[PDB]
Amino acid sequence: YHVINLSRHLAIVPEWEDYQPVFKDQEIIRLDPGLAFGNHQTTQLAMLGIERAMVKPLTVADVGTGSGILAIAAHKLGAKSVLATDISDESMTAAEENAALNGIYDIALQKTSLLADVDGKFDLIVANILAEILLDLIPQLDSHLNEDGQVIFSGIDYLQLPKIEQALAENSFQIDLKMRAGRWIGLAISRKH
Amino acid sequence: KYYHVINLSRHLAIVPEWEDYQPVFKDQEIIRLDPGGNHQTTQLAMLGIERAMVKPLTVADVGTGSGILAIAAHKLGAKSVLATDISDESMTAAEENAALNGIYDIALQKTSLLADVDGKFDLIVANILAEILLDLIPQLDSHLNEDGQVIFSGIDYLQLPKIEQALAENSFQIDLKMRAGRWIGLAISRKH
């Protein structure tokens, strides 16, 4: 373990480290490796999408939050609100504890599969999860997305992209930005316009 | 043409010199431009720069045009920035746009690509036609520091296979490929 530089404005650091970034305004996100949850490439793709999308405070749902990394980054980047969801107790623990390590106590957490039983709508839905689960998320997006709502997917293997692209088209979503690092794909998504 | 605010990212917006813009986020940097390639290719190159600038890097912006990418790199905390173009009009625009943002230490050189450029850089940025990028590719090695990175934008997706070929032949690899509409941006580094 050491510092994972994601961008000019984001680095990830293990909780024990005493790290001073050369850029004083580069945000440092502390994570506890002893807790559950990831993939550095897919995290970076999702983060670049969030950096692109967050031109004003947006309401955010981070689906399949795992360690909470993306929910935490969204909060630091000025989200209007953040809901983080996952299926496991240990994700709920990791997200809360990792948030707290970064001095954040107001990220809302819900133990739930995808967006089942999530009442509100959001400006930004973010999901770094495997493509077969994304396929189940796609038909849920519309009813949980504000008008002008945007979506960021990551964790897509390149071989899975046709199936993702077809399901997005079928649900009237377009891809504004496609990113590929190694075999991994990230997408910035909005309603067909 | 008419020019409006271009909201690039959380940390950057491009604003026409005259336009009074108060960003919602207090710390979203504003780049002022007179008048002010296009939106899409600029945004891809910017994402590349945002990803790459994890510490102060020495930067070369090739085919600078308005000087937008040179200025953005400077604002994101580049150690130094050299901007090149063949055109006298571009040299003027880049100088004036830099001054409009209170920047006076971007180096400017009127030259084709990296011919006549002495020295090497941590980061080479070029948002230009793919045909010109093809000529730039063999110039990269001798102008790039070890662990140096290269950002290309301005590629139409149909012209990508020839760029990929020329990069491979010059012992470069693509770390990140970005596509928005028909436009391609690339983050590039030395192979192994």
Fold observed for domain B36-192: Rossmann fold (3.40.50)
Instruction: Report how far apart, in Å, the C-alpha atoms of B30 and of each of A188, B14, B133 are.
Output: 24, 6, 29
- Choose among B25, B55, B177: nearest Cβ to A78: B25
Give the gyration radius of chain B's Cα atoms. 16
Domain spans in chain A, listed from the N-terminal domain onward: 1-193
Q: For residue A128, how many C-alpha atoms fall within 13 Å in the half-sphere facing its CB?
A: 24
Fold observed for domain A1-193: Rossmann fold (3.40.50)
Helices H / strands E in chain A, number of each:
5, 10
CA dist., res. B96 & res. B92, Å (int): 6
A44 vs B contacts (CB less than 8 Å) = 51
User: What is the CB neighbour count within 10 angstroms for residue A56?
Assistant: 14
* CB-CB under 8 Å, B178 with A177: yes
Angle at Cα A42 formed by Cα A39 and Cα A43, nearest 5°? 80
The single residue listed with the structure tokens 């949850």 is: A37
CB-based contact, A52 to chain B, within 8 Å: yes
> Which candidate, A2, A35, A37, places its Cα nearest to that of A17?
A2
Angle at Cα A155 formed by Cα A27 and Cα B162, nearest 5°? 95
CA dist., res. B155 & res. B131, Å (int): 9
Q: What is the enclosing helix (H) or strand (E) of A46?
A: helix A40-53
Q: Token pair for residue B130? A: 């793919």
CB-based contact, A61 to chain B, within 8 Å: no
The single residue listed with the structure tokens 């067909």 is: A192
Q: Is A172 exposed, middle or buried (0-12, 13-18, 19+ CB in 10 A)?
A: exposed
Order the strands of the A10-14 sheet from edge to edge.
A4-7, A10-14, A27-31
> Which candidate, A50, A56, A39, A38, places its Cα nearest to that of A10?
A50
State phi, psi for B54 to the nearest 5 degrees. -85, -10
A181 → chain B, closest CA residue = B176
CA dist., res. A110 & res. A84, Å (int): 6
Q: What is the enclosing helix (H) or strand (E) of A189?
A: strand A184-191
Instruction: For residue B33, give the 3-state DSSP assignment.
Output: strand
Q: Token pair for residue B109? A: 């050189």
Handedness of CA A104, A12, B8, B20 (dihedral sign): positive
What CATH architecture applies to the domain B1-36? Helix non-globular (6.10)
DSSP E strand boundaries for A112-144: 122-128
CA dist., res. B4 & res. B16, Å (int): 7
CA distance A156 to chain B (A): 14
Resolution of the experimental model, in Å, one decimal: 2.0
DSSP E strand boundaries for A91-183: 108-111, 122-128, 145-157, 173-181
* CB-CB under 8 Å, B55 with A7: no
CA distance B50 to chain A (A): 5
CB-based contact, B51 to chain A, within 8 Å: yes
CB-based contact, A113 to chain B, within 8 Å: no
Cβ atoms of A184 and A159 within 8 Å: the answer is: no
* CB-CB under 8 Å, A48 with B51: yes
Does the annotation list B63 as a binding residue?
yes
> Which candidate, A178, A190, A108, places its Cα nearest to that of A146?
A190
- Choose among A54, A176, A180: nearest Cβ to B177: A180
B48 vs A contacts (CB less than 8 Å) = none
Residue type, A30: R
The single residue listed with the structure tokens 């077809």 is: A166
Residues 6+ apart with CB under 8 A from B175: A181, B149, B187, B188, B189
CB-based contact, A51 to chain B, within 8 Å: yes
Query: Identical fold at B1-36 and B36-192?
Result: no
CA dist., res. A167 & res. A187, Å (int): 13
Facing residues of B179 across strands? A178, B184
CA dist., res. B134 & res. B128, Å (int): 10
Cβ atoms of A123 and A84 within 8 Å: the answer is: no
